[PDB]
Scaffold this active site. Structure first.
Site, PDB file in Angstrom:
ATOM      1  N   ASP A 159      77.708 133.783 -55.882  1.00 40.05           N
ATOM      2  CA  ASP A 159      77.508 132.626 -54.986  1.00 40.05           C
ATOM      3  C   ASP A 159      76.302 132.842 -54.067  1.00 40.05           C
ATOM      4  O   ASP A 159      75.700 133.939 -54.041  1.00 40.05           O
ATOM      5  CB  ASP A 159      78.762 132.350 -54.146  1.00 40.05           C
ATOM      6  CG  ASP A 159      79.066 133.437 -53.153  1.00 40.05           C
ATOM      7  OD1 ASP A 159      79.259 134.595 -53.620  1.00 40.05           O
ATOM      8  OD2 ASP A 159      79.155 133.104 -51.948  1.00 40.05           O
ATOM      9  N   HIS A 485      78.754 136.185 -64.508  1.00 40.69           N
ATOM     10  CA  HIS A 485      79.124 135.151 -63.582  1.00 40.69           C
ATOM     11  C   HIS A 485      78.225 135.308 -62.379  1.00 40.69           C
ATOM     12  O   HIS A 485      78.563 135.993 -61.404  1.00 40.69           O
ATOM     13  CB  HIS A 485      80.605 135.296 -63.221  1.00 40.69           C
ATOM     14  CG  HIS A 485      81.094 134.310 -62.202  1.00 40.69           C
ATOM     15  ND1 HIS A 485      80.988 134.519 -60.846  1.00 40.69           N
ATOM     16  CD2 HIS A 485      81.715 133.111 -62.343  1.00 40.69           C
ATOM     17  CE1 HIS A 485      81.484 133.481 -60.195  1.00 40.69           C
ATOM     18  NE2 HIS A 485      81.944 132.615 -61.088  1.00 40.69           N
ATOM     19  N   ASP A 517      82.612 138.708 -71.505  1.00 46.15           N
ATOM     20  CA  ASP A 517      81.232 138.472 -71.118  1.00 46.15           C
ATOM     21  C   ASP A 517      80.900 136.979 -71.255  1.00 46.15           C
ATOM     22  O   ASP A 517      80.203 136.552 -72.187  1.00 46.15           O
ATOM     23  CB  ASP A 517      80.318 139.347 -71.959  1.00 46.15           C
ATOM     24  CG  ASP A 517      78.854 139.212 -71.576  1.00 46.15           C
ATOM     25  OD1 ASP A 517      78.568 138.836 -70.418  1.00 46.15           O
ATOM     26  OD2 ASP A 517      78.019 139.501 -72.480  1.00 46.15           O
ATOM     27  N   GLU A 526      81.891 138.987 -62.687  1.00 46.45           N
ATOM     28  CA  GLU A 526      81.199 138.689 -61.436  1.00 46.45           C
ATOM     29  C   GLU A 526      80.250 139.848 -61.058  1.00 46.45           C
ATOM     30  O   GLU A 526      80.416 140.970 -61.531  1.00 46.45           O
ATOM     31  CB  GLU A 526      82.253 138.457 -60.334  1.00 46.45           C
ATOM     32  CG  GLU A 526      81.825 138.471 -58.878  1.00 46.45           C
ATOM     33  CD  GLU A 526      81.030 137.287 -58.406  1.00 46.45           C
ATOM     34  OE1 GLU A 526      80.328 136.633 -59.211  1.00 46.45           O
ATOM     35  OE2 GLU A 526      81.021 137.094 -57.169  1.00 46.45           O
TER      36      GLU A 526
END
Ligand SMILES: [Ca+2]
Ligand SMILES: [Ca+2]
Ligand SMILES: [Cl-]
Ligand SMILES: [Cl-]
Ligand SMILES: [Mg+2]
Length: 547
Positions: A159, A485, A517, A526
């Site tokens: 993020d 991710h 993956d 992540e």
């Protein structure tokens, strides 16, 4: 038996390292090492050890060719299968460098230019010069809606938000290892914009985030906003296409303390670099003392997002980094402040909050970072302080002895990876790497090679010697994650992911195989600055110690 079944460190081995590969399944009785160039037979192994984990019926066979010590390229043949590998000096140096360079790719508020970035270049994103005081963060001179600038710093992870707890912890860990290996880091050059100045590149990188952290402190009461965030996570879009409003939210005791600890730490480390960072050492220390003061006044001011959302709008739904146990942050901060100021008033706070046992470092458990500070060599401790440090050393060694028990009989020949509880969100960093870091410190405190040997074993695990056959770091090894991710890698128009990131790993079938993956796997794929901090810590120290 496929080539695929041969599980090994996909980067290779140092000449004097233990050298072990594990066949993941199948009947094996013999293996051979050949010189890949001359075709000479170099080693033959027989009478092989086998083992199984509690949860998998696969027979794992250990292949030990440690006696091969000549640098070169070799072929390992087992049954039908083969793999080539290298024995060479500095085999983990590209890993250590890439792991650190990952932070450069995470930088906000600046262009990411091809000169330094290679094919993963991009325009500046998230200037964060127009950021709102959320109602949860309001103060007398800063009512809800006040606009502040809070620029620079890294994106946290997959993020695009920036968090004081996690980034403070991350720098704290990397700077702990920095202090042990000054020459190594002075010589390291990773081709960042700051590679031609007079400051070690690791410290340049840290400063990019430290400079942002300074802006998260309220100039009045000294408190520190928990994070800088949008109300919701963005979609998988490029930073320049992000449109949500950015906020700073509620001050927290843990933010204040992790800020205080890392700023006190940084004050010492940047004292020599007034040329490139004029005034920072002094500013950091002043800021640290003000943040610690705030935390003393508000010792139970935890960050609870659910409670915040019941009182304030807009609701915030990004990473919580919540914690109701601040003793360890008080310990780490007071310890750093004691070492930076010499003041007994800080020492007493550290002693009051001392851990009773050693536990590996993690973002919410900073006892170890305080312990590492107390165990630092060259610092001339008085009788009482040496006695205290010695007690912490004892606890580190108790932990280390327990961790290494039986490691040579495990299927994958490492302390990590033979207990189902070893697998969880972020386990490759939180447990495998940070267990390794802990073992490396135990070696430094004793000179007992067994602890270091075990740290290299855990590194071999993440680099391919495991149940899936992945080298779990993007851009390195033979079979590595191509679909992390990671909003940056996922939204660029480049097939290969940004290199150098340790993915979280298996997180539950066999628990050590619960890894996919794919870009949607927050659970297993992540990436994060605290996970890369662990990788920088272990890879750099293992490379530095190899000589
Ligand atoms: Ca530099
Ligand atoms: Ca804590
Ligand atoms: Cl986001
Ligand atoms: Cl632990
Ligand atoms: Mg991409």
């Amino acid at each position: 038996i496929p080539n695929d079944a041969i599980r090994l460190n996909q980067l290779g081995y140092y000449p004097n390292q233990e050298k072990i590969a594990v066949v993941d399944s199948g009947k094996v009785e013999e293996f051979v090492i050949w010189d890949a160039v001359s075709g000479e037979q170099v080693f033959v192994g027989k009478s092989l050890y086998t083992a199984k984990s509690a949860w998998s019926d696969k027979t794992r066979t250990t292949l030990d060719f440690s006696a091969v010590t000549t640098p070169g390229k070799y072929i390992l043949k087992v049954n039908g299968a083969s793999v080539t590998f290298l024995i060479k000096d500095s085999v983990l140096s590209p890993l250590a460098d890439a792991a650190l360079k990952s932070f450069y790719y995470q930088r906000t508020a600046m262009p990411i230019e091809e000169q330094y970035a290679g094919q993963w270049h991009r325009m500046a994103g998230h200037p964060d010069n127009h950021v709102l005081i959320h109602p949860s963060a309001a103060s007398p001179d800063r009512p809800a809606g006040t606009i502040v600038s809070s620029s620079k710093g890294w994106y946290d992870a997959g993020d695009y938000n920036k968090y004081i707890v996690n980034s403070g912890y991350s720098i704290g860990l990397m700077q702990s290892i920095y202090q042990l290996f000054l020459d190594y880091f002075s010589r390291q050059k990773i081709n960042i914009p700051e590679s031609n100045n007079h400051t070690p590149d690791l410290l340049d990188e840290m400063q990019f985030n430290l400079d942002w952290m300074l802006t998260m402190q309220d100039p009045e009461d000294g408190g520190v906003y928990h994070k800088l965030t949008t109300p919701f996570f963005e979609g998988f879009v490029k930073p320049v296409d992000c449109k949500q409003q950015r906020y700073v939210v509620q001050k927290s005791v843990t933010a204040a303390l992790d800020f205080a600890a890392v700023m006190a730490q940084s004050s010492r480390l940047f004292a020599s670099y007034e040329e490139d960072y004029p005034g920072f050492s002094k500013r950091a220390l002043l800021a640290a003392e003000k943040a610690y003061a705030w935390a003393e006044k508000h010792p139970e001011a935890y960050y609870n997002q659910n409670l915040l959302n019941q009182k304030y709008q807009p609701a915030i739904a990004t990473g919580e980094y919540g914690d109701t146990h601040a003793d360890d942050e008080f310990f780490w901060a007071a310890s750093e402040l004691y070492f930076s100021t010499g003041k007994e008033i800080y020492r007493e706070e550290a002693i009051k909050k001392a851990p009773q046992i050693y536990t590996a470092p993690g973002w919410g458990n900073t006892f170890a970072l305080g312990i590492f500070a107390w165990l630092q060599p060259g610092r001339e401790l008085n009788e009482a302080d040496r006695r205290f440090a010695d007690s912490l050393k004892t606890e580190l060694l108790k932990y280390a002895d327990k961790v290494i028990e039986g490691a040579e009989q495990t299927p994958f020949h490492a302390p990590y990876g033979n207990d189902a509880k070893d697998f969880f969100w972020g386990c490759l960093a939180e447990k495998c790497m940070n267990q390794g870091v802990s073992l490396m410190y135990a070696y430094l405190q004793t000179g007992k090679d067994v602890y270091l040997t075990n740290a290299y074993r855990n590194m071999d695990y993440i680099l391919g010697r495991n149940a899936t056959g992945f080298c779990y770091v993007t851009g390195l090894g033979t079979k590595s994650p191509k679909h992390p991710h990671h909003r940056l890698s996922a939204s660029d128009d480049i097939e290969d992911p940004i290199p150098g990131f340790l993915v979280g790993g298996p997180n539950p079938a066999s628990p050590d195989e619960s890894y996919v993956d794919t870009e949607d796997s927050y659970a297993s794929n992540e990436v994060a600055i605290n996970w890369n901090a662990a990788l920088v810590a272990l890879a750099s120290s293992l490379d530095a110690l190899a000589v």
